[PDB]
Design a protein around this ligand. Structure first.
Ligand SMILES: Cc1cc2nc3c(=O)[nH]c(=O)nc-3n(C[C@H](O)[C@H](O)[C@H](O)COP(=O)(O)OP(=O)(O)OC[C@H]3O[C@@H](n4cnc5c(N)ncnc54)[C@H](O)[C@@H]3O)c2cc1C
Ligand SMILES: Cc1cc2nc3c(=O)[nH]c(=O)nc-3n(C[C@H](O)[C@H](O)[C@H](O)COP(=O)(O)OP(=O)(O)OC[C@H]3O[C@@H](n4cnc5c(N)ncnc54)[C@H](O)[C@@H]3O)c2cc1C
Ligand SMILES: O=C1Oc2ccccc2C(=O)[C@@H]1C[C@H]1C(=O)Oc2ccccc2C1=O
Ligand SMILES: O=C1Oc2ccccc2C(=O)[C@@H]1C[C@H]1C(=O)Oc2ccccc2C1=O
Ligand SMILES: O=C1Oc2ccccc2C(=O)[C@@H]1C[C@H]1C(=O)Oc2ccccc2C1=O
Lengths: 273, 273
């Protein structure tokens, strides 16, 4: 695994946190196997998470009607993005594997990490309308979420009061990671870390290092391939008619988001096929 | 409707935006019906969206191992939260109706709005473990999302390339809003707003104002009531045995998150029953 490069994006303010220890465990395990490891500790960086015209240097094209998508895309093509954004984009370009380490907050990513996606995943660089999802710019990379929660796993089971964790993960793993082309690996889910004692926390750290010894060879999560859809406005970007006809008598839909009104395949966003 | 109060939280930097126009339309229509209207224009406020120990003044309980949940709950009880947080909490306490107006960004809320939830929805003030979801502190209030998207409506249909919008809405409407006790009203979904001509946009604003004339009398979205679950940590907050047995022979699950491996009832997060 010499020659492969990893990026660990951490979103936690405290160096005493378990999230920080998971970042250190990941970095140590990957380096031991020959990886180059680069980090984005967003809190330690004082990372600015708010998109604004200060993400762009030089001339704005239409300052009287500011449109962040058009202006940032033009800035990317012309080399006029803010230097802190350019630095993060270079880390992404270099990385084969991207690990996102964060506590679950309000059933999603921390605001500082959401803003990192918004400022760094600029159009053309991270996605194109003509090549969404599996054809996206990051299709040669793999991404993985490593999440800690306060709530127990049972709260996020099919019968738990919070509802299916697979639904919670969908907008992040499909809408952010896979939209840009990433193959998304099984998330590392560390449930109710606040009710886990010290020696058990050590084994959680060791298990994560163990998994990282062969993470590049894992099967990724299943998303419906874009070849199943008519990618044009005359068809409305809907699934092809012959695909709908083939699926019409299967009991399960294709994924969490493409459940088709049927049963969601079990752990679609948690376990590979 | 004189006597009732609304809070409009806007997450868009541009006064020239359609989001700002929707905020202005909402304020004018409610005021014309006698509502008191307060605003949290997060960009114009320069709102700080990043949780940290600077959200808390005075003596921390354990500064050597800072844990935001325990420290912020204690700070709320002792009156040691940062003044900008306190002011937003007072806005929430006064409001009967809360409108969230924002463009969809990476299939969720903008980072500045995500951080508003993180800094303002403090434990004990906005939620308690002993009274989750429909017993929560905001159970006398109603909330509504007013979202604009770049993508078209068909892209978010069951057969569309992005998948079911009901799945994308679930973590925000059930997890952020309903967990605190809000009754959640049908979201105002404005699709492909960058490809909607001017004639149509004007009518969208008039329709939004029309809806707001009787917004308080609408039926809210359906979430499984907390009485269906055993509400204690030891029991994992799992659905009651008798309830599981009774739902076993039903063809549809109860909601997006409580789909129970069965068909999701149509537009559970988009249309009231
Ligand atoms: C705004 C906010 C929103 C939240 N929303 C949700 C939600 O929606 N759903 C949900 O389930 N939870 C939610 N939570 C809870 C959150 O997910 C947990 O608090 C978080 O995952 C805890 O992870 P941590 O790194 O902070 O652990 P910490 O509390 O910092 O540490 C946990 C334990 O691990 C110890 N530890 C540290 N380093 C090591 C080491 N090398 N080796 C062994 N042990 C170590 C620590 O000393 C500590 O005892 C929220 C929390 C906040 C602040
Ligand atoms: C980081 C980022 C991430 C994004 N992620 C997603 C995603 O995941 N999925 C998705 O579908 N989209 C996504 N988008 C697109 C985003 O949702 C749309 O760009 C946004 O909703 C557009 O709303 P707006 O208010 O900015 O519209 P504007 O472009 O500001 O306005 C649209 C038209 O309405 C006009 N208008 C303004 N005021 C009025 C008025 N009083 N009366 C009549 N017309 C008026 C405006 O002049 C303009 O011509 C993303 C955008 C960004 C920047
Ligand atoms: O489930 C949750 O959802 C949240 C959503 C928004 C903000 C914070 C939280 C939490 O703290 C966690 C975990 C939370 C915890 O950490 O400890 C508990 C102890 C007893 C009963 C229940 C729990 C929990 O669910
Ligand atoms: O309205 C339309 O309907 C069509 C019917 C048949 C053939 C072509 C088209 C179009 O190009 C689009 C324009 C189209 C639209 O209206 O929605 C969008 C939403 C997001 C991004 C881009 C667009 C468009 O270009
Ligand atoms: O504006 C657009 O341009 C297009 C042109 C041709 C075909 C499809 C599209 C789109 O999907 C939309 C919206 C587009 C979308 O649907 O999802 C996103 C997710 C992340 C970031 C940005 C966006 C968008 O703007």
């Amino acid at each position: 695994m010499v020659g492969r490069r990893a990026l660990i994006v951490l979103a936690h303010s405290e160096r005493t946190s378990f999230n920080y220890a998971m970042k250190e465990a990941a970095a140590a395990a990957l380096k031991k196997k020959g990886w180059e490891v680069v980090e984005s500790d967003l809190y330690a960086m004082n990372f600015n998470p708010i998109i604004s015209r200060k993400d762009i240097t030089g001339k704005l094209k239409d300052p009287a009607n500011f449109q962040y998508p058009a202006e940032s895309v033009l800035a990317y093509k012309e080399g006029r993005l803010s230097p802190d954004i350019v630095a993060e984009q270079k880390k992404l370009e270099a990385a084969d594997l991207v690990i996102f380490q964060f506590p679950l907050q309000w059933f999603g990513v921390p605001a500082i990490l959401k803003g990192w996606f918004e400022r760094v995943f600029i159009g053309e660089f991270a996605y194109t309308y003509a090549a969404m999802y599996d054809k996206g710019p990051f299709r040669s990379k793999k991404a993985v979420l490593s999440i800690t929660t306060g709530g127990s796993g049972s709260m996020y089971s099919l019968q738990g009061i919070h509802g299916d964790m697979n639904v919670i993960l969908w907008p992040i793993q499909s809408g952010i990671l896979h939209f840009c082309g990433f193959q998304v690996l099984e998330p590392q889910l560390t449930y109710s870390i606040g009710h886990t004692p010290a020696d058990a926390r050590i084994q959680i750290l060791e298990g994560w290092k163990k998994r990282l010894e062969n993470i590049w060879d894992e099967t990724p999560l299943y998303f419906a391939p874009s070849s199943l859809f008519d990618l044009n406005f005359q068809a409305g970007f809907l699934m092809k008619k012959e695909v709908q006809d083939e699926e019409k008598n299967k009991k399960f839909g294709l994924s969490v988001g493409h459940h088709l009104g049927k049963s969601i395949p079990t752990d679609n966003q948690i376990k590979a096929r």
